[PDB]
Design a protein around this ligand. Structure first.
Ligand SMILES: Cc1cc(C)[n+](CCc2c[nH]cn2)c(C)c1
Ligand SMILES: [Hg+2]
Ligand SMILES: [Zn+2]
Length: 256
């Protein structure tokens, strides 16, 4: 099945998932000089105070921190969005080296990692129905650079020993995603897709301009994760990113 290697990687995905070559695929390069400030974007609203994390899963391509989305507790609204989108999970993409890892690029610049906070449009009832809709998902993308440690990331870094291999999961209640945001909520927005198979073009992408910085020793522990399952040849979890895809007519809007 699909992966990130020479034989199952992003350039093989189209065979099984033809939308790989579609009209609104992600990620893309954010040309800062082509992006246009949009006066009609309302302010962004990130309400993560009542957030109920539940568990962390190594799913063999990344790790997911999952939230109880049965109520409006952690939500995105405002900005390019109409109505309410609930937080279901977050996860990251990162590299083997600091000079690569992000999925979106800013003027062809690759950051060391990329955080995705995934939300679904409540008027669709569940996550599964929202992924069948062009306005179904809203993803908040946040870049990571290496520098000083990110305090709000450390509880995640500490649990990764317990989820080394594909299929393992640990209990991860009372985690606050507020600790993963940068200071500023400036953002580029565009219409797009899931960046992993099945690559559904159901996403409103909100990519923040200001990266968070993380320690070298925080990313190092990300890099110790395995793609494989327990008792298999060790395959390190690195370079789990899709490269930038063609923009194709689409327009990236700036909030600032
Ligand atoms: C990065 C990413 C995040 C999520 C929630 N998903 C799940 C989407 C999905 C498709 N069919 C059922 N769920 C995928 C495939 C990728
Ligand atoms: Hg869709
Ligand atoms: Zn992602």
């Amino acid at each position: 099945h699909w992966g990130y290697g020479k034989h199952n990687g992003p350039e093989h995905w189209h065979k099984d998932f033809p939308i790989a070559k579609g009209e609104r695929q992600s990620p893309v390069d954010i040309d800062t000089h082509t992006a246009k400030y949009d006066p009609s974007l309302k302010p962004l609203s990130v309400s993560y105070d009542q957030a109920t994390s539940l568990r962390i899963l190594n799913n063999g391509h990344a790790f997911n921190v999952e939230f109880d989305d049965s109520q409006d507790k952690a939500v995105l609204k405002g900005g390019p969005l109409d109505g309410t989108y609930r937080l279901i999970q977050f996860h990251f993409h990162w590299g083997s080296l600091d000079g690569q890892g992000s999925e979106h690029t800013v003027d062809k610049k690759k950051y060391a990692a990329e955080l995705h906070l995934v939300h679904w449009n409540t008027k669709y009832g569940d996550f599964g129905k929202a992924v069948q809709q062009p306005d179904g998902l809203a993803v908040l993308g946040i870049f990571l650079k290496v520098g000083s440690a990110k305090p709000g990331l450390q509880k995640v870094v500490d649990v990764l020993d317990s989820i080394k291999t594909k299929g393992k999961s640990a209990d991860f209640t009372n985690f606050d995603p507020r600790g993963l945001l940068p200071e500023s909520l400036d953002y580029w927005t565009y219409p797009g897709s899931l960046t992993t198979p099945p690559l559904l073009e159901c996403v409103t992408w909100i990519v923040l301009k200001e990266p968070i910085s993380v320690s070298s020793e925080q990313v190092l522990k990300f890099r110790k994760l395995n793609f494989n399952g327990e008792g298999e040849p060790e395959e390190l979890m690195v370079d789990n990113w899709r490269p930038a895809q063609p923009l194709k007519n689409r327009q990236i809007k700036a909030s600032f």
